[PDB]
Structure 1
Amino acid sequence: MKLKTTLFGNVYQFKDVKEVLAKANELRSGDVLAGVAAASSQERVAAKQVLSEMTVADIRNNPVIAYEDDCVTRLIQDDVNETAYNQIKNWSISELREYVLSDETSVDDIAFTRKGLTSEVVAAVAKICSNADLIYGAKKMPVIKKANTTIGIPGTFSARLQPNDTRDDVQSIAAQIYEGLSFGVGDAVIGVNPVTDDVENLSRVLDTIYGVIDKFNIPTQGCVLAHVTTQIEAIRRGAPGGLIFQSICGSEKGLKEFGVELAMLDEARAVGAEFNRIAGENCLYFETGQGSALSAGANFGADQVTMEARNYGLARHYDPFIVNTVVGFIGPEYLYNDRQIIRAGLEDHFMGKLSGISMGCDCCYTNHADADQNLNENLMILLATAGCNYIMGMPLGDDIMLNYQTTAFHDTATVRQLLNLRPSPEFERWLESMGIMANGRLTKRAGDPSLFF
């Protein structure tokens, strides 16, 4: 393989695959903080060309972290279909991008092709893709999962009801639930980020969510985004189990920073199958986002785009119901402004759909970041056309406890009626029977939480 190219008569030399992957990224504040970004716009294009001419085998055999030193790398490598790999091992990254974008490439073609890929190869394709490439490419790669709702069907669009509170006050949590349902949000999950991490509080939060679900016979699933250990213990003790959540990182050191082992995710899988109130076969939930590996000091000199793709190769092993990047949750040190956050959102979703996972996105930003709510509305619609499986939902997007702004309840209703998309088919029937939705559109009495009283 070549680690060198000539651009306008200038030879650009790169040390290894890891540097080419980093410098091929579009400019973002995280790669600068990591000291791996390109020095000029010319070197960036040079890295893209070098990357485009490398083969699948060149990137499959050079992961950012060694096999014998990282369980995530081992998990990604052990899951590769070697027959599907041998068919494409000699394709260039340029030819894999054109293969994905081709209209003569069907969904079933990709279903087998993606099995021969690794996360580093998934990131490589996104690096040489434009914004419309990431949108059109992700659109033709639908991933369909099923819990008590079906998610990912082309022509549908789901949303997570996120009723977070500063004191885990159940009256405040229930109020945000009725508000979200009145807009058609909740077919993805009704998931609360808890303040205190103890079994008794999680059960109280869970009983609140499932009290609403059972009273109105809502086809959906609840979840409390605590640590997976405390979620397993709570469900074992009798708390109603829906989705089991865990924040993941793309390295073994990153998982240790989060206090997570791979055996915990195995236990959550077995605990869900024995206890959880799920009709379908998918019950796990993961959240990701660029910068988490570098924040943990666990990126090992790799760029945040490649590290984020490793989240998806790890998540793919456990076949979860939903995954979503939290694109701008951290801060401007990893994603600075609107341009970078939109790009990262399209990248993450494309890499997620390419990795074969039920990929959503928390279109969000922080207040110390160079962004506002018009950014979230731009990204949520771009991702909707990309076939994004779901977004978040909060009253006007204001999270009163996580100190950031995501997408509003109004936003999912806007996206659905703008693009003629429906909710999950099971959830849509409930909304119709509740008088909240007719023909995919909100009724006159929709948007009114007092309708449940």
Structure 2
Amino acid sequence: MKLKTTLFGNVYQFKDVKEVLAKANELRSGDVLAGVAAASSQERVAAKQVLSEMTVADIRNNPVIAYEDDCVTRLIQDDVNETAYNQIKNWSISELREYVLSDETSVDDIAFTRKGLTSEVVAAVAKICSNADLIYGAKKMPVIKKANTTIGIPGTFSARLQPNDTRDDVQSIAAQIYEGLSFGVGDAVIGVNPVTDDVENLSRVLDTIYGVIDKFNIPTQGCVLAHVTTQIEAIRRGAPGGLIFQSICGSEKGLKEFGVELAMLDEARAVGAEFNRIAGENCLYFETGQGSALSAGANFGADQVTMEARNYGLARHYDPFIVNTVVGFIGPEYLYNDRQIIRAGLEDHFMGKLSGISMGCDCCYTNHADADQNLNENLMILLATAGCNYIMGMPLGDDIMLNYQTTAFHDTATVRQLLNLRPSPEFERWLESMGIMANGRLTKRAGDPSLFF
């Protein structure tokens, strides 16, 4: 295989695939912090060309972390459909990119092709894609899942109600819930990030969430985004189960950083089948984001885009209901400004859709990064046109606990009426009977949380 090319008469030679995957990335502060970024725009373009000329077999046979050394690599390699792989193993990444972008390629064609891929090959395609390539490519790759609502249908747009409080106070959490429901937010999940991690806290938050669900017969699901072990524990002891959440990393050492074993995710799948109040077949929830492996010292010289794609290969194994990247949650040391956060959000969603998971995105930023709320509104609309399955929702996007800014409840209603998108069909039926929505638009009395009183 070729690891070198000549650009403008100058020869650009690279050491291995891991360097080609990293230097083909668009410029971001995380690849510079890892020392794997390209030195100039010429070497970045040269790395893209070498990457585009490598075959699917070249990248599949060279995982950034060895098989025998990483359980995430094993899971990705073991889950490959070898018949689908042998069909495409000799395709160059340039040909695979044009295959995904082709209008002659149907959704059913990609359904079998993506099974012959690994996360390293998925990341390789995103690296040689433009921003419009990432949006149009992901739009023609919808992924539909079902819990108590159906998510991912083209023409629909869901949103997670995120009611976080500085003390996990059930009065503050309920207040944000009635505000989000009045805007049509909550068909993805009503997920609470807990300021604590004790079992009696989770059950108290879950009892508050489901008290509202059972009161108005809301077709949705609840979740408290604590560690998966204490989620399993609370549900095993009587707490109402809906979605089971766990943060994931693209490497085994990254999972050990979060205290997560793969057996814990198998147990979450078994606890949900025995306990959870889910009509559909999908009840798991994962969240990702570039820079997690680098933060845990568990990237092994790989770039944060390749490591993020390994999240999607790991999540695909458990067929979750929803996955969303938290694109700008950490800080500028991994994604500095508006340009890098938008690019990462488009890459992450495209790679998640190419991996076959219900990919959403937390269009967000932090106050120590070079960004503002206009970035969240820029990316939320770009990803919506890309068919993003869902975004987050908070009052004005101000998280009083996580100390960051995400999208507002106004933002989901804006995207839905701007692009003529509907909620989940089960959730839309409830908003109509509640007098909150008509023809996908908010009624006059909508946006008023005192309507529920």
TM range (shorter): over 0.9
Cα deviation, 1:286-307, whole Å, max 9, x if unaligned, reads 0000000000000000000000
1:196 Cα offset (Å): 1.0
Runs of 4+ in 1 over 6 A off after TM superposition: none
The equivalent of 1:209 in structure 2 is 209
The equivalent of 2:450 in structure 1 is 450
Distance 1:85 1:191 in 2: 37
Distance 1:368 1:196 in 2: 24
Q: Secondary structure at the match of 1:399?
A: coil
The equivalent of 1:186 in structure 2 is 186
The equivalent of 2:361 in structure 1 is 361
Q: Which 5+ residue runs of structure 1 have no aligned equivalent? A: none
Q: Which 5+ residue runs of structure 2 have no aligned equivalent? A: none
1:63 Cα offset (Å): 0.4
The equivalent of 2:231 in structure 1 is 231
Q: Secondary structure at the match of 1:297?
A: coil
1:166 Cα offset (Å): 0.2
1:382 Cα offset (Å): 0.0
Cα deviation, 1:245-293, whole Å, max 9, x if unaligned, reads 0000000000000000000000000000000000000000000000000
* TM-score normalised by the chain length of structure 2: 1.00
Distance 1:239 1:97 in 2: 46
Q: Secondary structure at the match of 1:279?
A: coil
Q: Secondary structure at the match of 2:160?
A: strand
1:217 Cα offset (Å): 0.2
Cα deviation, 1:284-333, whole Å, max 9, x if unaligned, reads 00000000000000000000000000000000000000000000000000
1:185 Cα offset (Å): 0.1
Distance 1:240 1:89 in 2: 46
Distance 1:355 1:438 in 2: 35
The equivalent of 1:43 in structure 2 is 43
1:399 Cα offset (Å): 0.2
1:174 Cα offset (Å): 0.2
Distance 1:78 1:318 in 2: 13
Distance 2:207 2:328 in 1: 31
The equivalent of 2:264 in structure 1 is 264
1:296 aligns with 2:296: yes
Distance 2:34 2:183 in 1: 41
- Count of aligned residue pairs for this structure pair: 453
Distance 1:410 1:126 in 2: 31
Cα deviation, 1:419-448, whole Å, max 9, x if unaligned, reads 000000000000000000000000000000
1:79 Cα offset (Å): 0.2
Distance 2:41 2:200 in 1: 54
Distance 1:171 1:235 in 2: 22
Cα deviation, 1:78-106, whole Å, max 9, x if unaligned, reads 00000000000000000000000000000
Cα deviation, 1:340-391, whole Å, max 9, x if unaligned, reads 0000000000000000000000000000000000000000000000000000
1:134 Cα offset (Å): 0.0
1:77 Cα offset (Å): 0.2
Distance 1:101 1:53 in 2: 17
1:199 Cα offset (Å): 0.7
How do residues 35-184 of structure 1 correspond to structure 2 at under 5 angstroms?
Answer: 35-184=35-184
Distance 1:33 1:201 in 2: 38
1:137 Cα offset (Å): 0.1
Q: Secondary structure at the match of 2:246?
A: strand
Q: Identity, % of aligned pairs? A: 100
* TM-score normalised by the chain length of structure 1: 1.00
Cα deviation, 1:167-199, whole Å, max 9, x if unaligned, reads 000000000000000000000000000011011
